Amino acid sequence: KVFGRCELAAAMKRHGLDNYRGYSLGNWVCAAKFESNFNTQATNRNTDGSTDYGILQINSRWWCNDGRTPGSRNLCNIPCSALLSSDITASVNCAKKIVSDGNGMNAWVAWRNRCKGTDVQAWIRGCRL
Numbered sequence: 133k134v135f136g137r138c139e140l141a142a143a144m145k146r147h148g149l150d151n152y153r154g155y156s157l158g159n160w161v162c163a164a165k166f167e168s169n170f171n172t173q174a175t176n177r178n179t180d181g182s183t184d185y186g187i188l189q190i191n192s193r194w195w196c197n198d199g200r201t202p203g204s205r206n207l208c209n210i211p212c213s214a215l216l217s218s219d220i221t222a223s224v225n226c227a228k229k230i231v232s233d234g235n236g237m238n239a240w241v242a243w244r245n246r247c248k249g250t251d252v253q254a255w256i257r258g259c260r261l
């Protein structure tokens with residue numbers, strides 16, 4: 133599913149990401165825009181051989197099992213394919229674990245490079261939330 137911006141914002145809000153560990157909702161919307169272009173089916177390889185999955189491009193190196201990332205962990209206890217669903221629940225629940233872990237949203241390279249330090253409230257401008 134390719135979410136609309138406000139559609140995604142509303143789903144993320146319902147799932148409690150607004151100001152989760154201090155990250156206002158626009159952070160999460162921004163991150164998804166640049167990680168996945170709002171596409172739940174997005175998959176991308178990394179140079180280490182891991183793959184990033186879904187709307188928030190959760191990585192098989194640590195967070196999910198895809199059976200093809202040697203030495204990796206599955207800290208969200210989920211098949212990576214579960215993260216490609218039109219329902220964002222599994223991705224959000226995993227994201228909450230990731231962001232709570234010490235490094236905050238820096239885990240998301242696109243967030244760090246494109247959202248951090250910017251007016252992220254612009255990403256929820258016009259949305260009824």
Ligand SMILES: c1ccc(-c2ccccn2)nc1
Pocket residue numbers: 166167168176177178179184189241242
């Ligand atoms: C190295 C550098 C960037 C990325 C990335 C960017 C957006 C979405 C997913 N992965 N991955 C590895």
Ligand SMILES: [Cl-]
Pocket residue numbers: 167168169174175176
């Ligand atoms: Cl993509």
Ligand SMILES: [Cl-]
Pocket residue numbers: 176177
């Ligand atoms: Cl990429």
Ligand SMILES: [Cl-]
Pocket residue numbers: 197206
């Ligand atoms: Cl596993």
Ligand SMILES: [Cl-]
Pocket residue numbers: 197198199200201202203204
């Ligand atoms: Cl694996």
Ligand SMILES: [Cl-]
Pocket residue numbers: 153154235236237
């Ligand atoms: Cl933080």
Ligand code: NA
Pocket residue numbers: 192193194195196197198199201204205206
């Ligand atoms: Na894994």
Ligand SMILES: [O]
Pocket residue numbers: 178184189191241
């Ligand atoms: O990534």
Ligand SMILES: [V+3]
Pocket residue numbers: 176177178184
């Ligand atoms: V990547």
